[PDB]
Amino acid sequence: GNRRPIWIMGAMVNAIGQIDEFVNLGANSIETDVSFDDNANPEYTYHGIPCDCGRNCKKYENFNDFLKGLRSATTPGNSKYQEKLVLVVFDLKTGSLYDNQANDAGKKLAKNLLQHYWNNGNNGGRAYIVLSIPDLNHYPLIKGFKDQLTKDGHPELMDKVGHDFSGNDDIGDVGKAYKKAGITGHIWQSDGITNCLPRGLSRVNAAVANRDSANGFINKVYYWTVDKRSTTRDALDAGVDGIMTNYPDVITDVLNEAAYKKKFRVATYDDNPWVTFK
Ligand SMILES: [Mg+2]
């Protein structure tokens, strides 16, 4: 049947210059860390130590600077536009906040994205965005984000927004979180661990089983962080939709292997990331 569209996602793309670096190596998507200040306002795109093996952990920007860069990379006609860059996952570092600031953090995030990425609806960046939350108990962040875009008069930009819970929680507990949050679509499911440590495919397989089941809730599954061809092949054979990597050119080389070219292709803008592949 048809080739599954795959998101090749650059890991820890936290400096404006790294957006071209990863996209030019073959990524169609990036993952970016977002730190929060003591008032739940996004502050930096900063991961810090410890981080993946072989990476400098300390590159960062002011978050709104990063968003203006990412807007340039994803706005047709801009001198820096990358037509291939179609998804951004924000790894929201809400661990520094109290649980009762999760909703406030969603609202602050929406205000910044509206102003600096979507430019108040004037010729904004076109990428789809996944709000990845590391703690299921922070699910109120989603309502905050949606209510703030609604208040600001751009509720439609939620068509460009999806969701992930990154903590490797049990799949049924993830689904309960989404039920609590009132969410019924646009759901990505991460599974992974730092490239520094080993991991098998058991939870990836459970996430794919949920995604492909008649009444499951996951639309897409992505596995992180994968820097080896063998691991790439294992994840593709498991049926994942995304692979997060420090080396997009390794993943691209695997997808260009003749057996994999028959079964997968690199996702473009017209592949809606919220639709389960059939
Ligand atoms: Mg991260």
- In the block, which residue shows the tokens 């968003």? 67
Contact 141, 165 (CB under 8 A): no
Residue 1 CA to ligand 1 centre (angstroms): 34
Which CATH class, in words, describes the domain spanning 1-278? alpha beta
Residue 195 CA to ligand 1 centre (angstroms): 12
Give residue 123's Cα distance to chain centre.
22
Q: Round to whole Å and give the CA distance between 152 and 212.
A: 36
User: What is the Cβ-side half-sphere exposure of residue 193, based on CA atoms within 13 angstroms?
Assistant: 11
Resolution in A: 1.6
Residue 266 phi/psi, 5° resolution? -75, 125
Q: What angle do CA 32, 162, 11 make, to 5 degrees?
A: 20
Residue 84 CA to ligand 1 centre (angstroms): 21
With 0-12 CB in 10 A as exposed, 13-18 as middle and 19+ as buried, what is 278? exposed
Residue 274 CA to ligand 1 centre (angstroms): 21
Residue 93 structure tokens = 């570092």
Residue 31 CA to ligand 1 centre (angstroms): 7
Q: How was this model experimentally determined?
A: X-ray
> In terms of DSSP bridges, do strands 264-266 and 29-34 run parallel, antiparallel, or are they unpaired?
unpaired
Residue 19 CA to ligand 1 centre (angstroms): 15
Residue 33 CA to ligand 1 centre (angstroms): 5
DSSP collapsed to 3 states, the chain: CCCEEEEEEECCCCCHHHHHHHHHCCCCEEEEEECECCCCCECECCCCCCCCCCCCCCCCCEHHHHHHHHHHHCCCCCCCCCCCCCEEEEEECHHHCCHHHHHHHHHHHHHHHHHHHCHHHCCCCCCEEEEEECCHHHCHHHHHHHHHHHHCCCHHHHHHEEEEECCCCCHHHHHHHHHHHCCCCCEEEEEECCCCCCCCCHHHHHHHHHHCCCCCCCCEEEEECCCCHHHHHHHHHCCCCEEEECCHHHHHHHHCCHHHHCCEEECCCCCCCCCCCC
Residue 262 CA to ligand 1 centre (angstroms): 31
Contact 205, 211 (CB under 8 A): no
Residue 57 phi/psi, 5° resolution? -95, 0
Residue 222 CA to ligand 1 centre (angstroms): 13
- In the block, which residue shows the tokens 């759901």? 187
CB atoms within 10 A of CB 268: 11
User: What is the Cβ-side half-sphere exposure of residue 37, based on CA atoms within 13 angstroms?
Assistant: 9
Residue 269 structure tokens = 């803008």
Residue 171 phi/psi, 5° resolution? -55, -40
Q: Round to whole Å and give the CA distance between 68 and 63.
A: 9
Q: Round to whole Å and give the CA distance between 129 and 23.
A: 16
Beta-carbon contacts of 187 under 8 Å, excluding residues fewer than 6 positions away, are 162, 163, 164, 178, 217, 218, 219, 220, 274
Residue 130 CA to ligand 1 centre (angstroms): 12
Residue 214 CA to ligand 1 centre (angstroms): 31
Residue 49 CA to ligand 1 centre (angstroms): 12
